Design an enzyme around this catalytic site. Sequence first.
Site, short mmCIF file in Angstrom:
data_model
loop_
_atom_site.label_atom_id
_atom_site.label_comp_id
_atom_site.label_asym_id
_atom_site.label_seq_id
_atom_site.Cartn_x
_atom_site.Cartn_y
_atom_site.Cartn_z
N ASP A 117 -35.45 19.79 0.70
CA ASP A 117 -36.28 19.18 0.88
C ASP A 117 -34.74 18.08 1.38
OD1 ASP A 117 -37.18 15.77 1.59
OD2 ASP A 117 -35.39 15.06 0.54
N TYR B 131 -27.56 12.12 3.30
CA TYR B 131 -26.99 12.75 1.97
C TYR B 131 -25.10 13.13 1.70
CZ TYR B 131 -32.07 12.33 0.57
OH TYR B 131 -33.30 11.62 1.09
N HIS C 285 -36.46 8.95 8.59
CA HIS C 285 -36.27 8.85 6.58
C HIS C 285 -37.02 6.87 6.77
CE1 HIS C 285 -32.82 9.55 3.97
NE2 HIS C 285 -34.32 8.70 3.88
N1 LIG Z 1 -37.05 9.53 1.91
C1 LIG Z 1 -36.81 8.94 0.84
O1 LIG Z 1 -36.11 7.83 1.29
C2 LIG Z 1 -36.14 9.73 -0.45
C3 LIG Z 1 -35.34 8.68 -1.67
C4 LIG Z 1 -35.15 8.89 -2.55
C5 LIG Z 1 -35.26 10.32 -3.21
N2 LIG Z 1 -36.03 11.22 -2.34
C6 LIG Z 1 -35.68 12.60 -2.45
O2 LIG Z 1 -36.20 12.61 -3.38
C7 LIG Z 1 -35.34 13.94 -4.16
C8 LIG Z 1 -35.61 13.24 -5.99
O3 LIG Z 1 -35.58 12.20 -6.07
P1 LIG Z 1 -34.02 10.77 -6.77
O4 LIG Z 1 -32.89 12.11 -6.60
O5 LIG Z 1 -33.98 10.26 -6.94
O6 LIG Z 1 -34.30 11.39 -8.37
P2 LIG Z 1 -35.68 12.11 -9.17
O7 LIG Z 1 -35.74 13.47 -9.07
O8 LIG Z 1 -36.27 11.00 -9.72
O9 LIG Z 1 -34.03 12.69 -10.45
C9 LIG Z 1 -33.26 13.43 -10.48
C10 LIG Z 1 -32.19 13.32 -11.57
O10 LIG Z 1 -33.01 13.93 -12.84
C11 LIG Z 1 -32.02 14.42 -13.32
N3 LIG Z 1 -32.79 15.37 -14.60
C12 LIG Z 1 -33.72 16.86 -13.11
N4 LIG Z 1 -34.39 17.45 -13.54
C13 LIG Z 1 -33.76 17.07 -15.34
C14 LIG Z 1 -34.50 17.49 -16.75
N5 LIG Z 1 -35.24 18.36 -16.16
N6 LIG Z 1 -34.41 16.91 -17.46
C15 LIG Z 1 -33.47 15.53 -17.16
N7 LIG Z 1 -32.74 15.06 -16.41
C16 LIG Z 1 -33.32 15.94 -15.43
C17 LIG Z 1 -30.43 14.97 -12.48
O11 LIG Z 1 -29.37 15.43 -12.95
P3 LIG Z 1 -28.87 16.66 -12.44
O12 LIG Z 1 -29.41 16.57 -11.03
O13 LIG Z 1 -27.41 16.00 -13.02
O14 LIG Z 1 -29.28 17.79 -13.07
C18 LIG Z 1 -31.02 14.10 -11.38
O15 LIG Z 1 -29.36 13.32 -12.73
C19 LIG Z 1 -34.17 13.14 -4.07
O16 LIG Z 1 -33.31 14.27 -4.56
C20 LIG Z 1 -34.28 12.83 -2.58
O17 LIG Z 1 -34.70 14.80 -1.82
C21 LIG Z 1 -36.75 10.87 -0.75
#
Ligand SMILES: NC(=O)c1ccc[n+]([C@@H]2O[C@H](COP(=O)([O-])OP(=O)(O)OC[C@H]3O[C@@H](n4cnc5c(N)ncnc54)[C@H](OP(=O)(O)O)[C@@H]3O)[C@@H](O)[C@H]2O)c1
EC number: 1.1.1.21
Length: 314
Positions: free
Chosen positions: A44, A49, A111
């Site tokens: 994704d 970003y 988005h």
């Molecule tokens: N459409 C939209 O508007 C929108 C908005 C928000 C997000 N998104 C998409 O959704 C994705 C996921 O959401 P997000 O990035 O907000 O957050 P998330 O996936 O809920 O959380 C990411 C965080 O969790 C940590 N983490 C990952 N796996 C872990 C594990 N097994 N144990 C402990 N901590 C862990 C990561 O640390 P490390 O990376 O340091 O390992 C990072 O700090 C985004 O990256 C993006 O691609 C889209």
Amino acid sequence: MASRILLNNGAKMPILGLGTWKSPPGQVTEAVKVAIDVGYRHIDCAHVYQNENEVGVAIQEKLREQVVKREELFIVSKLWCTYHEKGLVKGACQKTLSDLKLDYLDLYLIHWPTGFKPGKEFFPLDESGNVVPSDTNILDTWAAMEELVDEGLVKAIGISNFNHLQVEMILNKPGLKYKPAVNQIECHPYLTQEKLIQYCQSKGIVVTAYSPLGSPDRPWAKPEDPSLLEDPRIKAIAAKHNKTTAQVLIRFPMQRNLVVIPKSVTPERIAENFKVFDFELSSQDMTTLLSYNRNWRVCALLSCTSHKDYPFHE
Ligand SMILES: NC(=O)c1ccc[n+]([C@@H]2O[C@H](COP(=O)([O-])OP(=O)(O)OC[C@H]3O[C@@H](n4cnc5c(N)ncnc54)[C@H](OP(=O)(O)O)[C@@H]3O)[C@@H](O)[C@H]2O)c1
């Protein structure tokens, strides 16, 4: 648990992908290479970003090394709010294609439903701090998205952060040519989204859950905020299944027939997070996780709450 879900364009989408928001440009190339080596087939991405070129270097090396064929990858990107004008959509798409080093995207999303004034700044501000909108409505932006399908630049189009009235506006668009394939929305035990998911699924739109771990690295995190990964009640479910708390939080949306896109740049967590096809939450566990809803959002687009198309008043 099948690994892919059928979309309304006839394509299959992997139900687990790798997120890339906040993945540093100097770490995301290795994150994506490790992810493809350990089985991920869905990435994704988004222009906003600022790391698509580095994501693209990973994808291109794994295709060149023949670790995976292009037809087996499912690459998603997103049109940023400053490109909703009809004459800017194709160039926005082609810049992302160039960065990702691809000749097509599997899925391209609007988005946010909110258009902003075009220009260099992703969040153009008035002299008091409000976002400056663009006059282009979302139905004309959807028509420009449909043109990308017909030009072969994208295999599917969809939406992100749309509320039910805004999904319905697309579905009711005069002359609609392609229905959205996906609505990507925030979803986790503190924001369970029951009503919007049931609406979208009843219309044959697949839902992708973002921030499934509660985005502990979000920039605006305040220490009094809820924290999914540290919730003792979710840790107890994970302990019962001999899994990690992240693995329960990733399996949870999968069993609601959602796609889920956890982000990590840590190789051990990327591999752990994929090991979720080997256990099942009970119906009692699923209902218990659903009961933790608090309507808490990671991503509330707070600078845009006066925009006509702001999605979260409803
Ligand atoms: N459409 C939209 O508007 C929108 C908005 C928000 C997000 N998104 C998409 O959704 C994705 C996921 O959401 P997000 O990035 O907000 O957050 P998330 O996936 O809920 O959380 C990411 C965080 O969790 C940590 N983490 C990952 N796996 C872990 C594990 N097994 N144990 C402990 N901590 C862990 C990561 O640390 P490390 O990376 O340091 O390992 C990072 O700090 C985004 O990256 C993006 O691609 C889209």
